[PDB]
Amino acid sequence: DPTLEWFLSHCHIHKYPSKSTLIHQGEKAETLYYIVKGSVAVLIKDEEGKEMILSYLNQGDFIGELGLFEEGQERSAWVRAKTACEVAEISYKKFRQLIQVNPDILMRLSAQMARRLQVTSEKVGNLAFLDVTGRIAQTLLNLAKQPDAMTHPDGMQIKITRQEIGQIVGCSRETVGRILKMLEDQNLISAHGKTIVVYG
Amino acid sequence: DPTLEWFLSHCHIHKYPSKSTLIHQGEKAETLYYIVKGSVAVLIKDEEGKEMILSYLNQGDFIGELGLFEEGQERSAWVRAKTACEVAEISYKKFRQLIQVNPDILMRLSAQMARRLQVTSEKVGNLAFLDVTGRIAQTLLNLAKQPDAMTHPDGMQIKITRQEIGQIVGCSRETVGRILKMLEDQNLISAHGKTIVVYGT
Ligand SMILES: Nc1ncnc2c1ncn2[C@@H]1O[C@@H]2CO[P@](O)(=S)O[C@H]2[C@H]1O
Ligand SMILES: Nc1ncnc2c1ncn2[C@@H]1O[C@@H]2CO[P@](O)(=S)O[C@H]2[C@H]1O
Ligand SMILES: Nc1ncnc2c1ncn2[C@@H]1O[C@@H]2CO[P@](O)(=S)O[C@H]2[C@H]1O
Ligand SMILES: Nc1ncnc2c1ncn2[C@@H]1O[C@@H]2CO[P@](O)(=S)O[C@H]2[C@H]1O
């Protein structure tokens, strides 16, 4: 992809090990990132340090983009590497010059912003309108149709901790365990360790 | 400024009365709108027809923008006029031609998308982390911080109905009215008119 190749030639690229923080909430935003390889989690926290994952992003995703548009703003969320990552970085000032040369690179960025607004709006709906059981069931459904889910005789096999589920749906790890047991009892999933088979 | 003037010269401008739907969820998206005058709400609905307000947008805001980026998408939300609106309309096709001329028009639209994603992300946190009283309290704090809030000797004065708060936080107007009376009793707010004063705001 020539447009992305051109953009990346103007970036400087860096390796982040698994679990490192790319972006800290509250930092002053002056640069844009783009994931060349790997995946990250975007998260927010409450007064007590409970975490809610807003999104996973992966190869091909921009990160740190929301600052490009307002002079001197603070990063709104933490971004943590879930795997080893290779990340390209560019200042906003240089990226604005690229936009002038070829506004297709802004279109690519803005397409991902629009998708993220839709996804996050759906999350608002889920938190407002679904109970925690329905949120968990929708999450397991989603993880099963992810590229990293492994086919199984009876559905798809996924690997996720109860803690990570609770960070997606907004509940404690104890509440996750109780709901997973219920779904097992209903013959809708199987659960063994960090492994869950989602039937159907 | 004259960027906005030039853009509006390529649009068709039309009027929506108060309460009328501009965009329905599920319609095919092929056109972008820009609010010349008025205010709208962006809304989603649950299975029982309960509504939740995702955003209020105003003069200078783009609406219907999210479908510009990928061909053949559905509208993701309803957009309903709060006051009567005058809205400029342009096809996605024509708008993409204007972007080549001056991409500041896409910068302005994307700055608004960026802000909306931050507001909606904060809403995810509030719904995950706060109970209904806490969500009402944060809604009042958010309204007291807005440009359109009025300085008052006890704090900031806002204008918002109980039904409006309920559609924002996800509760009935009667639940809102009970909780505002409670907050008043804790000496945190005044009710009164159509009007709430958020103390220490
Ligand atoms: N709801 C959401 N969905 C996806 N990415 C998000 C998000 N909220 C914030 N981010 C990302 O998290 C980053 C935090 O730094 P920013 O410069 S505000 O840019 C932000 C986006 O890249
Ligand atoms: N309302 C909620 N209650 C409890 N935990 C929550 C929560 N919303 C998000 N979380 C996160 O979900 C996590 C699930 O595992 P924990 O180790 S109990 O830590 C929890 C918090 O970090
Ligand atoms: N969370 C949100 N905040 C603000 N506006 C939103 C929103 N979700 C959707 N919208 C607006 O609602 C519109 C519905 O039609 P679209 O073409 S998907 O464009 C959408 C945006 O203008
Ligand atoms: N959990 C909930 N309970 C009641 N109303 C809710 C709700 N979530 C969203 N709403 C909406 O909030 C509105 C507040 O005013 P109503 O006229 S009672 O109509 C209500 C519903 O449309």
Author numbering:
A (entry chain A): 9 to 208
B (entry chain B): 9 to 209
Sentences from the paper on this structure:
CAP regulates the transcription of over 100 genes required for the metabolism of diverse carbon sources through its binding to a specific promoter region and recruitment of RNA polymerase. Negative allosteric cooperativity between cAMP binding sites in CAP occurs as a consequence of the protein-ligand contacts formed.
We used cAMP analogues to weaken CAP-cAMP interactions as an essential test of the predictions of the ENM. We selected Sp-cAMPS to remove the interaction between ligand and the Arg-82/Ser-83 pair, cIMP to remove the interaction between ligand, and the Thr-127/Ser-128 pair, and 2′-deoxy-cAMP to remove the interaction between ligand and the Gly-71/Glu-72 pair. We determined the crystal structure of CAP bound to Sp-cAMPS to confirm that the data were not explained by an unexpected change in the structure of CAP. Fig. 4a shows the x-ray crystal structure of CAP bound to Sp-cAMPS overlaid onto the structure of CAP bound to cAMP and demonstrates no significant difference in structure (root mean square deviation = 0.24 Å over 2177 atoms). We observe no significant conformational rearrangement of the ligand contacting residues, and the only inferred difference is the loss of a hydrogen bond between the phosphorothioate moiety of Sp-cAMPS and the hydroxyl group of Ser-83. The experimental data are therefore not explained by a change in protein conformation. The binding affinities of Sp-cAMPS and cIMP for CAP are therefore reduced in comparison to cAMP, as expected. Furthermore, K2/K1 for both analogues is also increased consistent with theoretical predictions. The computed and experimental data therefore demonstrate an unambiguous relationship between ligand interaction strength and allostery.
